[PDB]
């Protein structure tokens, strides 16, 4: 989708806010938010692409200025409510209860050894997106390709700033989960993946750095020539 989140080449967002040091987690709430990445995919219902798409659908003004891990809470709720696994009315009721009783306990629950094993395994084993497919790569190193000007309303990895621009294929990586399907609940439908080099002059015209290139990863259907 043509969301504000697609910020590559956006002007006016202002100077970088970089404190000299920071902790990994700035608040206990951030640890809870982080733990929802592996909770969401543990339950195989939703993957990383759909998780991204929930964030892309945020109120942009909220997205641009909220703490990062708020984005993770929004996307978990977005999928929760759509699948009926989260009741919004019950959630608003609980939000108010915990506004008024911040130190009220969490619900009593059994710990689960399987959740620790699942975490350790995902963290050190990874969740690989590489897939085998029956067709060979359409394209190769040195091929000069134009990125699609298609503008899907669901999830995709088509940064506005590379659309209809010309580049050179740098590397074929194999086939991977295809966002345009996986992120819209239409499954993996894996596609060959390529890194493509775009010059700064191609991307930005004469206002681009005279001696700079951007490398952007393109699934096969994103490119022709």
């Amino acid at each position: 989708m043509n969301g504000v989140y697609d910020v590559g080449g956006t002007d006016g967002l202002g100077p970088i806010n970089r404190p000299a040091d920071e902790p990994v987690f700035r608040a206990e709430w951030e640890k809870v938010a982080f733990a929802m990445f592996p909770a969401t995919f543990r339950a195989g219902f939703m993957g990383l692409d759909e998780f991204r798409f929930g964030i892309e659908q945020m109120n942009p003004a909220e997205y641009l200025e909220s703490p990062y891990y708020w984005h993770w809470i929004r996307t978990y709720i977005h999928h929760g409510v759509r699948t009926g696994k989260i009741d919004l009315e019950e959630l608003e009721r609980r939000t108010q209860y915990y506004r008024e009783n911040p130190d009220a306990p969490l619900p009593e629950h059994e710990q689960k050894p399987e959740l620790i094993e699942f975490v350790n395994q995902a963290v050190y084993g990874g969740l690989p997106a590489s897939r085998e497919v029956d067709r060979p790569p359409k394209f190769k190193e040195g091929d000069v390709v134009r990125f699609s000007t298609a503008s899907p309303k669901g999830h995709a990895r088509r940064a506005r700033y590379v659309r209809g621009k010309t580049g050179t294929v740098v590397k074929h990586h194999g086939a991977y989960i295809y966002p345009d399907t996986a992120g819209n609940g239409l499954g993996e439908c894996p596609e060959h993946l390529y890194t493509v080099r775009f010059t700064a002059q191609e991307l930005w015209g004469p206002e681009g750095d005279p001696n700079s290139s951007v490398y952007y990863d393109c699934w096969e259907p994103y490119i022709e020539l």
């Binding site: 080449g9 100077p15 970088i16 909770a39 809470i73 969490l106 690989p128 700033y161 990586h173 991977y176």
Partner: protein, 202 residues
């Protein structure tokens, strides 16, 4: 400045309540436990950090054949040091030279090689860096990181639009001939491996 925005205190207080509410429902559904949350936090607070990336760097600096394997296939080379997994299943390492400076970004979100760098710092995930580094990389490196890349030197910006994670092998600082792997490691930073700074001088 945004005249419509609440205080940091009011934002934190509202987020805290919303998260505890969401957490209470996920606990009751059995898909979240206190132990699961504590384990994820403990891993990225104390187990997985840029000290891992630093070992890969100093090995490539002191081992030409390991460097070639790192540049050929970052995932396979990092597995030689027992380093890999979540959000670095597919790593491509790229080499700073006298000809070329590399800097990495996720313009679309925050994608970052967790297994070598741990979780990205907040500035990396925020719109200011993400929007500007693909468009004014030399000016950004100068103004934000005090890092002057001479105009004749090409700046390559790697935008992680896929599960491929890009990692910078920074140049070995001058005056470190014959240094131990441990001495060289004190020079390797998170920033040097994003490409927003060189490795430390001296």
């Amino acid at each position: 400045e945004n005249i419509t925005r609440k205080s940091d205190e009011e934002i934190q207080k509202e987020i805290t309540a919303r998260v505890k509410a969401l957490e209470s429902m996920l606990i009751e559904q059995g898909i979240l436990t206190t132990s699961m949350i504590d384990r994820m936090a403990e891993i990225y607070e104390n187990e997985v950090g840029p000290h891992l990336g630093a070992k890969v760097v100093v090995k490539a600096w002191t081992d030409p054949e390991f460097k070639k394997r790192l540049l050929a296939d970052g995932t396979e080379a990092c597995k030689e040091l027992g380093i890999g997994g979540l959000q670095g299943e597919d790593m491509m390492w790229v080499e700073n030279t006298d000809e070329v400076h590399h800097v990495v970004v996720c313009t679309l979100c925050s994608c970052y090689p967790w297994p070598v760098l741990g979780l990205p710092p907040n500035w990396f995930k925020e719109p200011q860096y993400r929007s500007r580094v693909v468009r004014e990389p030399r000016q950004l490196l100068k103004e934000e990181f005090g890092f002057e890349v001479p105009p004749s030197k090409e700046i390559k910006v790697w935008d992680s639009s896929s599960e491929m994670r890009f990692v910078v092998l920074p140049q070995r600082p001058a005056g470190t001939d014959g240094w131990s792997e441990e001495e060289l490691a004190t020079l390797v930073t998170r920033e040097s491996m994003i490409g927003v700074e060189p490795a430390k001088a001296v």
